[model samples]
Target: VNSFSGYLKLTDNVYIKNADIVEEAKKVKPTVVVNAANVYLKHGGGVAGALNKATNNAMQVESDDYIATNGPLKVGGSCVLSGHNLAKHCLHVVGPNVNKGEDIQLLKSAYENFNQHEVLLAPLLSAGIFGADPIHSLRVCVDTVRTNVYLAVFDKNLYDKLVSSFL
Candidate 1:
C-alpha cells in the first residue's frame, strides 16, 4: 500500500526503487532506461538479460547491430537503442571492470553519459560481475548520474544496508 516501502527518494530527481528493473520501468514509464552493458553490448545475463527478455529480444538484435556498426563500446562509452514494451530508448553504457584498475572515473563517466528530459531508470552499473561494491556504486551514482534518474534494485535487502548509510 506504500510506495516508499520499495522506494527511496535520494535526491530531487535521483531515487532508489527496490524492484525488478523492467517492472519499475513499466510503472514509471521512463523516457529512457539505462542498461549496464558490456563492451560487446550483449544483453546476455543479469539486468541486461532481464531487460532483453522484457523488451522482446529487441535488445539483443539492436545491440548486435550497434556493435557491428560502431565497434565495441569502450568502458565509459555510451549508445542508444529502441525499447519495445516499457521504455522508449535504452541507453547502453559500459563501465570499468573493477579488477582491472581504478573504476570510479569510468563508472562516473558512464553515469554521466546519460541526460534525459523526463524519467530515467537505470541499474547499479558495474556492481555485479564487474565486481564493484553496490553501495559504492550508489554513492558514485548519487554524485554523477542524471538529475531525473531512478536506480532500480532487485533485492530489498540492499535496503538493510542502505538504512545505515542514510541514517
Candidate 2:
C-alpha cells in the first residue's frame, strides 16, 4: 500500500497518514476506529463530521443514542459503538477542550484507554474545532503506546504541513 504524502513510521505498524483514512479503512478494515468528538458526540464538524457524512449520518445517530442512555461524557472518556462504513467498532472519545491545559493529557489518555486490537485508525486529536496545535497533537499521538496506529489527516494543507515538518 502506498503511504500518504507525509507518512511517518514511528514504529513497525504505527504510521502517520495512509491515503484517505475512511477509504483506506474500508480496504484494511480496522477492528476499531477512534473518532474525535466533544462531550456530546456532536459530529457536526471535523473528522467526526466527515466520518458521519461518509456513513450517511449513521454514526451520529447511533452515538447520540449511546449518549442518551449513558449521560454526558467526561474528557478522555470513550464509548465503543457500532461502526458503519469503516469497521465494526467505533471508539468515540471526548478530547480536551481547545486551549485547555488538559487537552494533551486527555488526548493521550484516549489512545491509552483503548484495548489492544488488530487495527486502529486515529486522527490528530483536538486539532480541529477544538483548536489544539496539530503538530503537538500529532506528537502526542505518536508518543502514545498503541498498535496498528494510522494517523489520519483530512485536509491537504494539514497533510502538507505534516509532510514538510518531517523533512
Candidate 3:
C-alpha cells in the first residue's frame, strides 16, 4: 500500500518524501527514473534491488542485456532501458564511489549523462552504501539538473536533514 502520497514541496517542480523510490515510481510512472547503480552496474541492494524486484525481474534482465551489449558501464556511465510497472524507462547510473574517496566530478558527470527527459524521479544517489554525504548528493543533483525532479527518500533522518535547507 505504498502508493504516492504526502509529498512535501521544496520548490517549483521539486518534491520530497520519505518513501521508497521503487514503490513510489510504480505509481508516478515518470518518463525517466534514475537508479543508483553499483560499480559492477549490477542490480543488488538499495535502489537497484528494489527496482529489479518491483519490475518483476525486468530490470535484471535488461541490466544483463545492457552489459552484454555494452560491456561494463564506467563509473559515471549508464544505460537506459524500458521499465515495467515502474517508469517508462530507467537510467541505471554508477555514482562516484565517494565511500572510497572518489571524486565528486564522476558523480556530477553521471548526472550530466542524460538530458532526454524533463521530469525525473531520483533518489539520494551515492549516499547509502557508497557513503556519500546526503547534502552533497542533493546539491550536485539540483545543480546539474534543470528540469523537474521528485526526490523519494526513505529515512526520516534524511528527510528531516534535507528538509532543513529548503526553508
Candidate 4:
C-alpha cells in the first residue's frame, strides 16, 4: 500500500489477503463467492486521482453502520457509488510508486494510521504499476510497513534490497 502509515492512522486498520482472489477461487471451492478483483485493480487503469475518489466513496459506505438489505447507499447513509463497488469486507490499498520518493514515508505512515484505527487492510488495488510488477510494489510497500502488510506479491529482487537498505 502507498501509505501503510496513513492507513494505520485511519480507523479500522487495513487487512491484506495472502492468496490471489482469482487464483484462490480457481484452486479452492467456496460458497457464495463474488469476484471483485478487477474492480479494485483496473477500475481506473491505475490512475491515482480516480482511485482516491473511489476509495473515498468506499470509506463513506463503511461509515454507515445502519443500512437495509437493499437500500440506496450513501456516505453515512444508504446511497452507494455506481460502477466501482468493492467486495464485501475489503480495504483496497493504493500501491506506492518507488519513483515517487515521497511515497515511502507516506506509505509507512498510512499503514501505521490504519493500525491505530483498527481497519482491516486488503491487497493493493494494483501492485504491478509503471513497469514495476505487483511483486516489486509489494516489497516496497512491506519494507515501509512490515507488520502492517497482510498479503502482496513481494518480488525477491526488491525484497532483498529493501531488507538491506532504506526505500
Candidate 5:
C-alpha cells in the first residue's frame, strides 16, 4: 500500500491468526518498533505490556531510569530502548488518553518523530484498550509515517475493517 504522493510506503503487510506480534516484528526486522507507554513509562496493560514481556522487561527498566532522571514524558513524545529483544531499537511513544481530541495528532507525532528509520512496526495506538477509533488511528498512521510500515493486525474483525478502509 502507498500514500501521500508516493512519499509514504506501507509494505510487509500480513494478517496474523495467532497474532504473535513479537515474532512478526522479528521477521520484519524493523529499524524501530513503536509501542504505547505512559509518561512514567508504566506497562501494566495493552501494547506496552506485551512489548514489555517480549523484551523481558528490559524496556521497563530503561524507561524507569529515563523517567527517574529526565522527568515524565510529555504527550506526543517518545523514548528509545536500544538493543532490545524485539528490535535493534524500540520507540516508547507517550500517546494521548482515550478522551483527548489530540489523539490523531499525537499518533502522527510518534510517527513523525521516528522519521530517521526506513521501516517501523506499529500497532493501532489508542485504538484497542485505550478506546480510540481504529479507523481514525489507521488514518493517522497512513498519513504521517514515511517509508515502510509493517502494521500487525491480530483481530479478524479489525483486519477486515482496516483492509476495507485501506482499499
Candidate 6:
C-alpha cells in the first residue's frame, strides 16, 4: 500500500486504496475486528472462498486479471502462494515495500493480533515454487543479514500481503 495511485491496479478487484494499506494497522480499533467471520468451506477454502461465502464478490486471488499481480502481499498472520487458485473471497493483505524498521514492528504486532498458519503457497524466494517476485526494480526488503531486532522469517508472500489487507 504505497499510495492511492498505487492501489488503482488492485482496486478493480478489492475496494481498497494503497494509502490505506500504508497506513499503520495499529489504527484499527480492537472492537472493529470481524469476529466469527464465516465462509462456507468447500473442499478447499481460502480468502476468496471465505469472502465468496460471505459477500459473493467473485474476485480472483493471484493470477486472475481482476487482481493485479504487483500489489501488496501480506494479509493478517499468514502468507499466500502464487497462482493459488481461489474461488470467492477477497484476500486480505498489507502493502509491500515497507521501511525496514516498520516491517519488524508491523509483523510483530500482526503476530500479536492474528494467528499464524502454514502458508498454502510458497514464496518467491522458493525459486518458482510460488511465482516470481513482483518487485523487479525494488531493492531487498530490510537488511539481508538477520539481526536480533527482526530475525524472524516467514514466506515472503505472507510478508508482502501482510502490509496491505486481511483475509
**RMSD (Å) per prediction:** 3.0, 3.2, 3.1, 11.4, 5.2, 16.9
TM-score of 4: 0.33
Error of 1 at 153 (Å): 0.8
Task: Report the candidate with higher TM-score, 3 versus 5.
Answer: 3
Off by over 4 Å in 5: 1-18, 99-104
Task: Show the lowest summed lDDT stretch of 10 residues, model 6.
Answer: 118-127
Best-to-worst order by lDDT is 3, 1, 2, 5, 4, 6
Residue by residue across 79-157, what tens digits does model 4's lDDT show?
A: 2222233323333333334444323333443333223322233344224453334444344445444333333222446
C-alpha lDDT of residue 99 in model 4:
42
The sequence of per-residue lDDT tens digits that candidate 6 reaches over residues 1-167 is 22112322222222222222112122321111111111111212332333333333332323233235443334223233222122111123332223222232333333322223211111112111112232320112222212111111133454455344433
Best by lDDT: 3
**Lowest-sum lDDT 10-residue window in model 2:** 1-10
**Candidate 4, after superposition: displacement of residue 69 in Å?**
23
Cα shift from native, residue 19, model 2 (Å): 3.5
lDDT of 5 by residue, 38-111 (tens): 77789887778887887788878887888888999877788777737777788887667776555555767765
Tens-digit lDDT track for model 1 on 1-167?
22223567887667776778888777766678888888888888888898898878978987888788889988998887886686778888888878667456788887777654355778888887778988888888777866677777777787557645752
Error of 5 at 20 (Å): 3.3
**For every model shown, what is its TM-score relative to the native structure?**
0.87, 0.82, 0.87, 0.33, 0.80, 0.20
- Winner on TM-score (2 vs 3): 3
Q: For each candidate, what is the lDDT?
A: 0.77, 0.74, 0.77, 0.33, 0.67, 0.24
Separately for all candidates shown, the number of backbone clashes (residues 3 or more apart, or on different chains) is 0, 0, 0, 47, 0, 30
Which digits, one per residue and each the tens of the lDDT, describe model 2 over residues 57-155?
999889889888988788987888877878778888777867556646677886675535556777767786777888877776667755667777778
Q: Which candidate order results from sorting by TM-score in descending order?
A: 3, 1, 2, 5, 4, 6
lDDT for 109 in candidate 5 is 74
